[PDB]
Amino acid sequence: KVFGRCELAAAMKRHGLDNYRGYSLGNWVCAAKFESNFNTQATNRNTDGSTDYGILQINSRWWCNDGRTPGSRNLCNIPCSALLSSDITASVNCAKKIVSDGNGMNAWVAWRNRCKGTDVQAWIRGCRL
């Protein structure tokens, strides 16, 4: 599924991401835009052989099991394919565990490089929230 901007904001808000560990909703919408272009089916292979999955490009090295990242962990206790669903519940629940591990949203390179320090409220402007 390819979300609209306000459609995704509303889904993320419903799932409890607004102000989660202090990150306002515009941060999460900005990260999804630049990680996946709002596409739940996005995948990208990394140099180390791991793969990033879904609307927030969660890494198989630490967070989900895809059966082909040897010596990896499955900290969210899910198959990586569950992160590609049109239902964002599994991605959101796993993202909550990532953002709580100490590094905040700095775990998402696109957030650090393209959202952090910008006017992230612009990403929810105009939406029915």
Swiss-Prot record:
C-type lysozyme domain: residues covered: 1-129
UniProt KW keywords: Allergen, Antimicrobial, Bacteriolytic enzyme, Disulfide bond, Glycosidase, Hydrolase, Secreted, Signal
UniProt-listed InterPro entries: Glyco_hydro_22 (IPR001916), Glyco_hydro_22_CS (IPR019799), Glyco_hydro_22_lys (IPR000974), Lysozyme-like_dom_sf (IPR023346)
Tree of life domain: Eukaryota
Catalytic class of the enzyme: hydrolase
Distribution of this protein across tissues and organs: In the egg white and polymorphonuclear leukocytes.
Residues annotated as binding substrate: D101
Function: Lysozymes have primarily a bacteriolytic function; those in tissues and body fluids are associated with the monocyte-macrophage system and enhance the activity of immunoagents. Has bacteriolytic activity against M.luteus.
Description of how the protein assembles with itself and partners: Monomer.
Note: Lysozyme C is capable of both hydrolysis and transglycosylation; it also shows a slight esterase activity. It acts rapidly on both peptide-substituted and unsubstituted peptidoglycan, and slowly on chitin oligosaccharides.
Protein name: Lysozyme C
Encoding gene, per UniProt annotation: LYZ
